[PDB]
Amino acid sequence: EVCNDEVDLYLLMDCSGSIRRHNWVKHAVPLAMKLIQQLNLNENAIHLYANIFSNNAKEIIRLHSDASKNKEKALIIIKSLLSTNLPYGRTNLSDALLQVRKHLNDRINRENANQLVVILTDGIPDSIQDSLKESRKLNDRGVKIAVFGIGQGINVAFNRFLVGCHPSDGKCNLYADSAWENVKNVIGPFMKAVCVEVEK
Ligand SMILES: [Cl-]
Ligand SMILES: [Mg+2]
Ligand SMILES: [Mg+2]
Numbered sequence: 001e002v003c004n005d006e007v008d009l010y011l012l013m014d015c016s017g018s019i020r021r022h023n024w025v026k027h028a029v030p031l032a033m034k035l036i037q038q039l040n041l042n043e044n045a046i047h048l049y050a051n052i053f054s055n056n057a058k059e060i061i062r063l064h065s066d067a068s069k070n071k072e073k074a075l076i077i078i079k080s081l082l083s084t085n086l087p088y089g090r091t092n093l094s095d096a097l098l099q100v101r102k103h104l105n106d107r108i109n110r111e112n113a114n115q116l117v118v119i120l121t122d123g124i125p126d127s128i129q130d131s132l133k134e135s136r137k138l139n140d141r142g143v144k145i146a147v148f149g150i151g152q153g154i155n156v157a158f159n160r161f162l163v164g165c166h167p168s169d170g171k172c173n174l175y176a177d178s179a180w181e182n183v184k185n186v187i188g189p190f191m192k193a194v195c196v197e198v199e200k
Contacts, residue, residue, distance in 0.1 A: 002188065003195040004040040007114040008047050008063060010103075011035070012096040014121040015052040018153055019087040023180050028087070028150075031120065031183045032078045035148075038191040041071045047110065048074055049103070052081070053096035054089030063108055093125035097134035104141050114198050115143040118191075122150040124158060135162055146194045148187065149177035173197045 003009070013032055015024070032050075039046045047068045050061035060077055067073035100117055103109050117138065125131040135145055147159040154177060157167035165172035173193040178186040 001040040002038050002192040004045055005114060005195065005199055006045065006110070006112060007116050007195075007198060008049065008103075008109045009039065010063075010100045010115075010117045011048060011050040011061075012057070012093070012100070012117060012119045013050065013052045014054065014091060014093075014119070014123065015081075015087045015089070016054045016091045016123055017088045018091075019122055021087065023151075024087045025082055027180050027183050028120070029078060029081050031148075031150075031187055032081075033075055034184050034187050035118070035120070035191060036071060036074050036078060038188060038195075039071070041069050041074060043069055047113070049100075050074075050078070051096055051099055052086065053092055054087065056092055057096040057099045059099065063103060091121070091123045091126050093119070093121070094127050094130035094134050097131060097138060100143070101134060101137055101141070104138070104143070115141070116194070116198050117143055117145045118194065119145070119147045119162075120150065121147065121154065121159075123153045124155045128158060131162070139164070144174065144198055146174040146190075146197075148183075148190055149175070150183060151180050 049063035051057045051059050061067050160167045163174035176190040
């Protein structure tokens with residue numbers, strides 16, 4: 001797998017109404033699945049955490065749980081997102097990022113592990129101010145943030161700012177975007193690039 005190191009990886013998956021149900025089912029859920037396929041989930045390698053966020057953040061995979069460390073178990077849970085009332089609601093990224101910072105506050109994370117947040121989003125946060133404030137607090141605790149933007153509702157400058165890049169210029173290995181139909185072709189190269197940056 002292209003991601004293979006001691007990393008606590010916090011997947012924050014936008015489930016906002018803008019997505020549309022057909023895209024949630026045909027693209028968003030399969031994209032999260034393929035992303036997880038890029039990870040060596042293992043006690044001594046990657047441990048996954050996952051939440052969804054729209055109105056609020058909701059944990060779906062607990063950090064260090066069996067599904068955190070086992071790809072087949074993680075994929076069952078992600079697939080279970082199909083049998084829900086999702087997608088719906090707004091884009092409370094700051095609450096999603098807050099849940100990550102609560103793990104760090106409470107020392108739930110492996111202190112020895114690289115800390116990586118990966119955001120899948122099709123929009124702009126409802127509060128850029130609070131999202132950037134949370135992101136700074138995470139950065140101060142050593143957390144790297146990556147963003148995979150989808151569709152026409154994103155703001156590239158903001159996503160680039162969030163991950164620590166110049167908003168328009170130069171290579172930004174912690175950022176990629178894609179049209180809805182193409183997400184599964186962009187996610188592999190993205191996760192490869194992200195994991196190279198995390199290891200360096
Ligand atoms: Cl927000
Ligand atoms: Mg907030
Ligand atoms: Mg949206």
